Design a protein around this ligand. Structure first.
Ligand code: A61
Lengths: 99, 99
């Protein structure tokens, strides 16, 4: 699909058996999801943005389906106010900026 | 142009007659630039990011050229970690997401 930016680029994703709404975010290096109880091993990490840093849990090789396009990579879980699909997964679904 | 996302989508902008580097950030509602001097009036504003809220100076109707594409809109100036171009200006240059 083609997504205009009049409104936030929110799309439905599937992760860990759950459906969620997430932002297609070209400004996010990594993918950050709202707090969720994923299984498996993880590593602590801190990511910075406007307002400072938040502490997140890094899970590796996590499958996410973004509007039917499958992807697998690193997913950070923490107290983010928004589900954020970052460039690590946007590349995998063939997403591009165009103007 | 068509921009892939294997690298951070950085572009050169011209604002107030000065060239700068900025990040095309579809996850940002607004455009936020690092501390700089801008001519004209400004109002104190607050914006929230992943790490909290910050104080910014809001400049309205500012000319900004992004990759030779002209835009005129609101530009916030404050302690952002990176110069980001938000949807308020991305829409003006006809920017869309495509996958
Ligand atoms: C460093 C570049 C920007 C921050 C400057 C990075 N952000 C992604 C943005 O898209 C962020 C994503 C975002 C969206 C909404 C709430 C919190 C974060 N949006 C944002 O902060 O926009 C602000 C300006 O306009 C306002 O509209 C949204 C908030 C305001 S982020 O959320 O902080 C982020 C995401 C993954 C990541 N991986 C390593 S660092 C890192 C930082």
């Amino acid at each position: 699909p083609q997504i205009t930016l009049w409104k936030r680029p929110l799309v439905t994703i599937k992760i860990g058996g759950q459906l969620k709404e997430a932002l297609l975010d070209t400004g996010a290096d990594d993918t950050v999801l709202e707090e969720m109880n994923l299984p498996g091993r993880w590593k602590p990490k801190m990511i910075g943005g406007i307002g400072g840093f938040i502490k997140v849990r890094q899970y590796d090789q996590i499958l996410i389906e973004i509007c039917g396009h499958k992807a697998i990579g690193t997913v950070l879980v923490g107290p983010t106010p928004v589900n954020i699909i970052g460039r690590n997964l946007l590349t995998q679904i063939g997403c591009t900026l165009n103007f």
